[PDB]
Amino acid sequence: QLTEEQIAEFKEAFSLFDKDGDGTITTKELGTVMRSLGQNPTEAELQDMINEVDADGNGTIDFPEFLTMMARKMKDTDSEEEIREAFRVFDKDGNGYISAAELRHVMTNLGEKLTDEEVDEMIREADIDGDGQVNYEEFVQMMTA
Amino acid sequence: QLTEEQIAEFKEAFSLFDKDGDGTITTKELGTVMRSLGQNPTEAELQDMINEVDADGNGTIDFPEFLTMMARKMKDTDSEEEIREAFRVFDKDGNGYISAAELRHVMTNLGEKLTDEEVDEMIREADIDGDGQVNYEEFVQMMTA
Amino acid sequence: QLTEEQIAEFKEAFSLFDKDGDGTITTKELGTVMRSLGQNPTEAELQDMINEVDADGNGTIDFPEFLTMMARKMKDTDSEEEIREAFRVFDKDGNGYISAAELRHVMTNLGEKLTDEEVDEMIREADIDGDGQVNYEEFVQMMTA
Amino acid sequence: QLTEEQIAEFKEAFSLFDKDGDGTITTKELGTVMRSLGQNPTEAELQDMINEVDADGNGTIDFPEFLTMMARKMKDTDSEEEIREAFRVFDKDGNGYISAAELRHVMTNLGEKLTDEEVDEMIREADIDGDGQVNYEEFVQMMTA
Amino acid sequence: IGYKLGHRRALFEKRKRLSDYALIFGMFGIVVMVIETELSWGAYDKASLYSLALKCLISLSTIILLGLIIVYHAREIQLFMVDNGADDWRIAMTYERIFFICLEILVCAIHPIPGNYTFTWTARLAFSYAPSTTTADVDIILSIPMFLRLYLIARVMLLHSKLFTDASSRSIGALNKINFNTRFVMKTLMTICPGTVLLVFSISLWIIAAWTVRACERYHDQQDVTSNFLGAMWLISITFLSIGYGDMVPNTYCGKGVCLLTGIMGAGCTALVVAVVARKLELTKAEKHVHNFMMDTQLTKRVKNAAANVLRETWLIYKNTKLVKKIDHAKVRKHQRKFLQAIHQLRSVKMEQRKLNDQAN
Amino acid sequence: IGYKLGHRRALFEKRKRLSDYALIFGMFGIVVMVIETELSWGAYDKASLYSLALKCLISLSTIILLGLIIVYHAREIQLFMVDNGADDWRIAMTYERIFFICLEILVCAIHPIPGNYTFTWTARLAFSYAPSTTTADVDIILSIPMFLRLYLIARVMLLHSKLFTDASSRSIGALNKINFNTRFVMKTLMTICPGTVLLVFSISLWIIAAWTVRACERYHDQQDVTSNFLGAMWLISITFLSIGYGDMVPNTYCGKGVCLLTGIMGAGCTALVVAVVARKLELTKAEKHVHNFMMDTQLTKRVKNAAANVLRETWLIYKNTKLVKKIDHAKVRKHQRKFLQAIHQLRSVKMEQRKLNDQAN
Amino acid sequence: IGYKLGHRRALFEKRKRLSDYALIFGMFGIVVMVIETELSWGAYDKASLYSLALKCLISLSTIILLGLIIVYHAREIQLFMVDNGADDWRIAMTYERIFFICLEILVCAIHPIPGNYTFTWTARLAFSYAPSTTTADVDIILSIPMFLRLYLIARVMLLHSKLFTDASSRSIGALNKINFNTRFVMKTLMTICPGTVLLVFSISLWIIAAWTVRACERYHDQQDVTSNFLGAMWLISITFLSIGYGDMVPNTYCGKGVCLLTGIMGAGCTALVVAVVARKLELTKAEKHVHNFMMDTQLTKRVKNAAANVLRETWLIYKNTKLVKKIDHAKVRKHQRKFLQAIHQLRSVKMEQRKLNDQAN
Amino acid sequence: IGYKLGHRRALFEKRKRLSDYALIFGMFGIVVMVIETELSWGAYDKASLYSLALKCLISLSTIILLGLIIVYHAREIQLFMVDNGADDWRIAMTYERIFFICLEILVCAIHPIPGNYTFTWTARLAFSYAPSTTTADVDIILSIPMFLRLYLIARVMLLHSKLFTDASSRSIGALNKINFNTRFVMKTLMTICPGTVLLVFSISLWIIAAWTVRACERYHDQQDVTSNFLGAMWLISITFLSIGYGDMVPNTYCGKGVCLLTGIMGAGCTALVVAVVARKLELTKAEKHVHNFMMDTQLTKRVKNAAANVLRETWLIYKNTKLVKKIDHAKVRKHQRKFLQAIHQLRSVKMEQRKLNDQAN
Ligand SMILES: O=C1Nc2c(ccc(Cl)c2Cl)/C1=N\O
Ligand SMILES: [Ca+2]
Ligand SMILES: [Ca+2]
Ligand SMILES: [Ca+2]
Ligand SMILES: [Ca+2]
Ligand SMILES: [Ca+2]
Ligand SMILES: [Ca+2]
Ligand SMILES: [Ca+2]
Ligand SMILES: [Ca+2]
Ligand SMILES: [K+]
Ligand SMILES: [K+]
Structure with missing residues (x-):
């Protein structure tokens, strides 16, 4: 269990983003920090980063949500974030879904060239395929569960 | 007592800021000098610098006022200016006052931890007026007088 | 004859320009590539480059047109392109023609001067149409057949 | 006299400013060259530079006017130009005339500290017209030619 | 939650303690080796019991050091399992972790074993090209490589760094995808305190290289030239600076190798120091x-x-x-x-x- | 068209194969020269039959190498005719192509011819200024220039490059009028992998120059100083670094020339390496x-x-x-x-x- | 205000005069030390009355110098009281100030005391490794560290600077909060006149280092090699440039230390000079x-x-x-x-x- | 007008021709000095008549050279009068013109005068510290400073430059107040062709310095070490590169001074060359x-x-x-x-x- 010193350190790290003191991180604060880091983002990207981690749905990052995401960020690398990145590599359109034809092309041509039967089994086992549009939910559920 | 040569040296130093022969330093001339010195002061900051030196409130720095401030500026360091700077460190907003709670927080948490009884005595003695917000005049009078 | 590997290499070179899958290089993909290459071509220059390569007059380069162009671009140097460049050196203001007086001045004054016998004999041999102003067609027809 | 080769050299030097086919250097064909040379002159400065050389008016420099000014520019350093520069050092107003008080100040205070009688004699001799505002013509005429 | 993060913190603390103990025991072994090397040339022989006592103490320190390194790598693998959501430790072994563990054990296992073993050493004297044959103890060949144990200093430096273990730093560096490794900490130190880093490195290299030069040279030196500690310090300083050798040329290939390594290090360290000085002479x-x-x-x-x-x-x-x-x-x-x-x-x-x-x- | 591109590709492949064979035969000749130089000092005399066999093998390799060079240049002229729309091969010959072909044949034609030819060699010993007269074989003067055959490595490196042969690279490089020659490829390599290029160049120069120093110095060295391979390696390393000669001054002008060339190369390579290190110590x-x-x-x-x-x-x-x-x-x-x-x-x-x-x- | 500024200006003038007198007396002591060192080797013995007269003169100069330094620091403390609104001088007495005053007095108190004291000096000759025993006078150990008195030159340079004393400069630098200290003046000089500063520093170091090399080397040199002033000048020049010792290796550790200090100084001064030349060869x-x-x-x-x-x-x-x-x-x-x-x-x-x-x- | 701007051009042409003749006669004198120095050591003695003939020829060349220098300066003063609208030539004399004219006459007046004058030369041999006394001719002291005449090359280079005399360049440079002097032309050459300038300067310095070392060292060298031209070339190359001296240390202070000057020149020329190479290895x-x-x-x-x-x-x-x-x-x-x-x-x-x-x- 965390001690008082560890909670203080994490609260200080939170204060690096929670400048106003509201007890929550808004989109503007994250944008200011990121632009101070020379990574000028868009409103869409800032909203996407604020989401995907705010479990309470308030639209702003809390302290427990910050602790939950720091549980992953303190590691040298994370699996879920990198699987999402690999998914977004081939989701150039941005629709959030991968067509069966594009996925088959990628798996048969780009990487280690899976056999056609293996690709057929994979695309069939993709439950979030929705009759063709494989979503990011299937990719996460394949490895996480 | 000042000699003719010293008076001439101070007069030419004054001329470095007194472009026109008006015999006084306005705000625009100080702004031009400071911008030549690689700064971008605001109108509020320039007005503040013109203040604190203006003995007679003509709105502009005279020659005797310049000599009076040069008396302080020829030293390696000045106590009053640095006390004002330390005051402005903890004065986050533009108000000339700091709340008693803020001063107690500052003096008990950050820096050399002052005793709570000592902090109470200091907040009582500094607040010469009944108001619980400590002004810059009280801090200056603490050390100057 | 080209093998499958050669066709694949040329196809990926073509794809380096054909961002959109239009099957043909539009006239804006060339601009985007050139600007990525640290250039700022004009609309007139872009149109001039996108022409001279398309034989179907569609205004867009196909794959066979790209192959024909690469047949010349893969060489260390091209004679026709350099003759066109030498022509454009003396074709000020993009006239497309050089007056007989200007051409005689060029060939007699600057560079290795010709004898006055061959001067204006060159013009008599050129200008098949008899207009009197030498066009880029005559210069190409000299070296070629 | 001048050989035809020397005339050709001066003609090509003239052509460095006279890009157009005419025989006059305008106010803009000089601005283009001076901006290529890393300067940003104004219309007033360009007009003054033209007027300092432009004989017979016309508002433009001819070829003989170019030869006349090159007779001065070819040597290592000139005298009239530097006297004009020294005059313009003290003519900060730009009116072209220096007040007698200003001349007395700049000749007694800074420099080699002329005697008062010498300054009086100089200011009397310079003020040929008796106006009391010494012009650039008087300074040039003092050194004769 | 509040348990996984505390578990990672406890694992990191255990790793840090193991690194500290490994550094302590490695430095203890190096120090006792230096003392025994100095004293066996003079005070006592190699067949004495003081030599046996000090070398047995060295061997015990080496055994404890090897145990500490093995337990440290076990804690590394356990933390790897915790981080990369793994339940089998065999996922950690990747033909590179095994190689580096084996290299670390090989480096930390070399030490002068107890005993009295001698070999014949022949070298050609400098400037006179005369042969020199001596019967040297094997312990010098096993003592000199013990200085390779100084990578544990780098390990401790990484593990005690504020950048490596601090929630604020990791949270900020996750936005720029910064890789928090030993290279990053070294580059940060070379940016903040370049002169101090170069000074510490140069002084430590100077003393270590001079001592190892005299330890190698004392066998074929009967004229007090390169076996002199102060002369060895001067030799290292003038090869570092690329002035040259005076009459101070090593008679042994160990000394020549040390001088070559010093010259290679100096060729770069001098230029880095000069860049630092040039930057520090510049106006703000x-x-x-x-x-x-x-x-x-x-x-x-x-x-x-x-x-x-x-x-x-x-x-x-x-x-x-x-x-x-x-x-x-x-x-x-x-x-x-x-x-x-x-x-x-x-x-x-x-x-x-x-x-x-x-x-x- | 689908024929001109195929014809140029076939000509490229033929030139590439000819370059590969020329490099193979040149390196074979150099290796057999090194073996024969090493073995004739010891195992067998210059009048034996092993010497004759190895030198005849060298001469046959040289004949095949000259043939391969000539056929390569014929293919180059044929490709020039294909490219610059020419029908007469005599357009290719431009008083510079002829000169470079002749220089290449002259460089590749030098080798130790079979036979037993000796000459008198007189040198002044270092540090003692004493004369030394030996009867040396002529084969050393013909063996040392054989290292000039290493330009074939540069030729192969250009011809195997992706930038020079790829269609995409040519298509984009034609927009900026990039000249795809050996200089461009070398500059690209020095931009991508500067440390690796400098390291490979330095190690190869080190070994080649040390062997050359040994081969020249073994004639006037009867004290095992500069004719020692390891001593020659040390000498090359300390003249490269400009620390200086120790007691390792060459007795011959061949050794002095090699050391001077090493010092000139080091004066620039050291600075380039230091710039690389300084760049690599900088934060992203x-x-x-x-x-x-x-x-x-x-x-x-x-x-x-x-x-x-x-x-x-x-x-x-x-x-x-x-x-x-x-x-x-x-x-x-x-x-x-x-x-x-x-x-x-x-x-x-x-x-x-x-x-x-x-x-x- | 008129009195307040006049008091500070008068204190500045007094402090500046004290610095001038301290520099005059320190330089007088150094010059008489150099004369006595040169003349006692030749003209007169150490038991002569000329030696006693010159050393008593040195001691009197040292006493006056110590008094001048103490009065200078009294004026410094008085000016400190005037500036930082203090009425007790004991506020100024921090540990740093006391330590620096003590260091200054210790540095300026070392001088060859009157008397005839000798010690035994043993050194190993260069290139021959032969011992040399001489009975040296103690006065050399006390004379050489007298060159440490040259910090008074830096003090005078700061106090005579226009930047440090001008009212216009102080008024302008108060806006940027510039710290007007010795470092700022030194960096300003290295900015405006780098070549002149480096030239003066190098020539003064050359002469001082060559003289101290010969003063140390004359005891164990009976062959006129390193005790020769012109030879010492050459030695200092070639260790400064890192070409290296010729046959000019010092026989003493004093000479070796001076040569090492010269090499360290040269390694940086050469690079700074080269940067200056490169900048001066650049077009405007x-x-x-x-x-x-x-x-x-x-x-x-x-x-x-x-x-x-x-x-x-x-x-x-x-x-x-x-x-x-x-x-x-x-x-x-x-x-x-x-x-x-x-x-x-x-x-x-x-x-x-x-x-x-x-x-x- | 046509009179002026053509009179100035005629004066320019006369001045340029005078510079050409002065360079021709100075180089003729240097070449005959080199020939006579080489031949009097061998073929003929100093009391011969070939020596007298060659030295009288040198003196006649020197007289003509001095006359040409004086007439050149007369033309300079005349052009100055034409430019700065002066009627009296005495305006041109400013103690700086006089000082530099006197310096040119002094530099160009030194030459080996006819006669047979000898002096006693004592030097300490290198590495052995043994004295050497020879009776040397005075002509060497008068021959070596004849290389100072090479400034006439710089004069001719300025006067033949296109930037200096072209009308277009002067008209354009008048708009930036460019000062067209020798420094500007030198900087322009170092910007356009840095490698060629450095190469020419280095090769000429190499040959001149090696010959000067040989000429000074041949008097005290009876072992063919530093009086060997090829050995002197090697010595100059390794002091230029700061590798050091081998067994090649000058026995004379003339040789030591030449080597020091070579080392100073090399310390800067090497860095400039390396900067040039680094720039040339960079991609466009x-x-x-x-x-x-x-x-x-x-x-x-x-x-x-x-x-x-x-x-x-x-x-x-x-x-x-x-x-x-x-x-x-x-x-x-x-x-x-x-x-x-x-x-x-x-x-x-x-x-x-x-x-x-x-x-x-
Ligand atoms: O340094 C300063 N010079 C100033 C200041 C403020 C006002 C004026 Cl007029 C002058 Cl000249 C200054 N700071 O308060
Ligand atoms: Ca907030
Ligand atoms: Ca939330
Ligand atoms: Ca004003
Ligand atoms: Ca006022
Ligand atoms: Ca397209
Ligand atoms: Ca088309
Ligand atoms: Ca015009
Ligand atoms: Ca006109
Ligand atoms: K060296
Ligand atoms: K060196």
């Missing part, structure tokens, strides 16, 4: 602004003086040419020369002003 | 942003602490001056000294913060 | 503009010439191909070769023009 | 654009491959964990290791991509 931006302001003031004053002299001489030339019944040509010539000098001064000061206005922006 | 832009952020955070904390100390000492001075019944001068003096220290700390930390905000732009 | 911005303009003119002319040659050769090829009844193939081939050359010239000159337009931005 | 801006484009293409392909591998291993872990009756756990562990490897590859290639996008602008 505010100091640059102030200096340019004051220089421009002086230039304006000097321009005014030059123009005044020009006008003065222009007046006096006329006053002594005309306005005088008897024209003294000598004085007129003097004033014409002074007029030309004033013109040249005005030109030069104006071009200085132009240069300063160019560097002012 | 993202790492710079993160570091500036963290340092600014620490600076803010220290500013707050300094200001707190300033206010604390001001209050303590006031209390012990005008609030205590009897003033303790020692205490008041101590607090005034601490107040001055706090003021200095505040000034210094604020100027550090100002400097950091300056470099943060 | 206006000169750059003029040069680019003229080069662009020449490139335009060459482009026109190349294009004219291209067109001429095209015409000649066409004429001799399809206009003459007797087709002379040699002429056509020559003109085709010239056409290809003209094409290459046009390409190269346009590449040069493109590069120049790139650097012209 | 267009080449940089092309290279960044191609590298970005390759990194995009690698990113796609890495992401495909990540997805493939994510699928295979699931297929071999679930969707199977029996789990081997060995293939599953292998696929989990490959999944982690693919994740690391994707992270690293994305880091490279973002670094390249950073350097792309």
